[PDB]
């Protein structure tokens, strides 16, 4: 069990004789606040059900956010489909300047100071998965040269 | 077309030295020969356009060369262009 704050909830719909049938999509974020965040998108016949599943699916999908002093290790641009996103680390006591999404995710990420911006499609879902792959691609001076050993 | 025999005459006539199967002087002399030939042709088959195209290329290619020549060396440029009697 972590923070567990849901990005967005919606009501999709499908067609069939007699009428349209519904379902619900819930996108949730789950982070401890020490460098662990998970992103799960849950769909099911009812809001609650959706919600929960999002959580479950989330925990089952997390990532080690290599924080540092309260911000990200370095600048990063990540294109994911139509969506794009920039992430720039700000000096301590700066703020988490990002839109609803990258925030909600980055808040639990553990970061307290980071500069951002949504580029291209601002779609939640996609920016969401966008933010993830962003983090999931960060590096530290250590694990950096840790690779260039030789 | 052009007999191997006649084609040679040209080559042997412009070779900057014994042998010399290629080179500017030559490549040019040769193109020319082909050009006029082809020229005289179309001067009869106006309707034969596709072949016309071929001329142009042959034509430009020669332009190119001379340009290089003129650049690299004027002396034997005037020479060649003169002997072939070109640039009208």
């Amino acid at each position: 069990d972590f923070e567990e704050k849901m990005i967005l909830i919606r009501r999709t719909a499908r067609m069939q004789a007699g009428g349209r049938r519904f379902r619900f999509g819930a996108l949730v974020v789950v982070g401890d606040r020490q460098g662990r965040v998970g992103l799960g998108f849950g769909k099911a016949p009812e809001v609650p059900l959706a919600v929960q599943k999002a959580g479950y699916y989330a925990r089952r999908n997390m990532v080690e956010v290599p924080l540092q002093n309260g911000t990200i290790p370095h600048e990063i641009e990540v294109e994911f489909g139509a969506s794009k996103i920039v992430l720039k680390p700000a000096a301590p006591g700066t703020g988490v300047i990002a839109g609803a999404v990258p925030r909600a995710i980055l808040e639990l990420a553990g970061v307290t100071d980071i500069l951002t911006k949504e580029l291209g499609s601002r779609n939640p879902i996609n920016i969401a998965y966008a933010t993830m792959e962003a983090l999931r691609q960060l590096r530290t001076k250590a694990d950096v040269e840790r690779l260039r050993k030789g | 077309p052009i007999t191997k025999e006649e084609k040679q005459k040209v080559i042997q006539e412009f070779a900057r030295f014994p042998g010399d199967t290629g080179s500017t002087e030559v490549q040019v002399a040769l193109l020319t020969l082909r050009i006029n030939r082809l020229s005289e042709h179309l001067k009869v088959h106006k309707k034969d356009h596709h072949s016309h195209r071929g001329l142009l290329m042959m034509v430009g290619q020669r332009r190119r060369l001379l340009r290089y020549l003129q650049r690299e060396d004027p002396e034997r440029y005037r020479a060649l262009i003169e002997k072939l009697g070109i640039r009208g």
């Binding site: 680390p89 590096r139 260039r148 | -």
Partner: protein, 138 residues
């Protein structure tokens, strides 16, 4: 006919790497080896060496990759996740000593040509100079 040989070298490298190959052979070029030397002197590649494909002198460039991975797509991470030329022939890119780039918040590099040799985003800065911002790796 290759307009910018350098941008090529990178691309050849950027491609061979993206597939995980032992070594790649970029055509001989003093100035090229420089970006190479530096590329290695900074630990991005096992190294390189001169060769000859029938009177055709190239340069074997040994690529360095990471450790195998756990899970789907067990494809080993790479040492160079990104190389991209800056100063292109279609738009020369020069920088003053105060203008030199800060590649990947320091984790990165930025090879560049200077009046006094080929240095990097730190070296050149230390030498306190400037020149054609050749490119950036990291």
């Amino acid at each position: 006919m290759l307009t910018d040989p350098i941008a090529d070298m990178l691309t050849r490298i950027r491609n061979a790497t993206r597939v995980y190959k032992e070594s790649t052979d970029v055509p001989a070029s003093r100035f090229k080896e420089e970006i190479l030397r530096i590329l290695a002197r900074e630990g991005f590649i096992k190294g390189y060496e001169r060769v000859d494909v029938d009177g055709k002198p190239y340069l074997r460039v040994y690529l360095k990759y990471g450790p195998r991975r756990q899970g789907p797509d067990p494809r080993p991470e790479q040492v160079i996740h990104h190389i991209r030329r800056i100063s292109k022939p279609g738009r020369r890119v020069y920088v003053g000593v105060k203008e030199i780039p800060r590649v990947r918040r320091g984790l990165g590099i930025a090879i560049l040509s200077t009046s006094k040799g080929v240095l990097t985003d730190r070296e050149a800065r230390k030498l306190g100079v400037g020149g054609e911002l050749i490119c950036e790796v990291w």
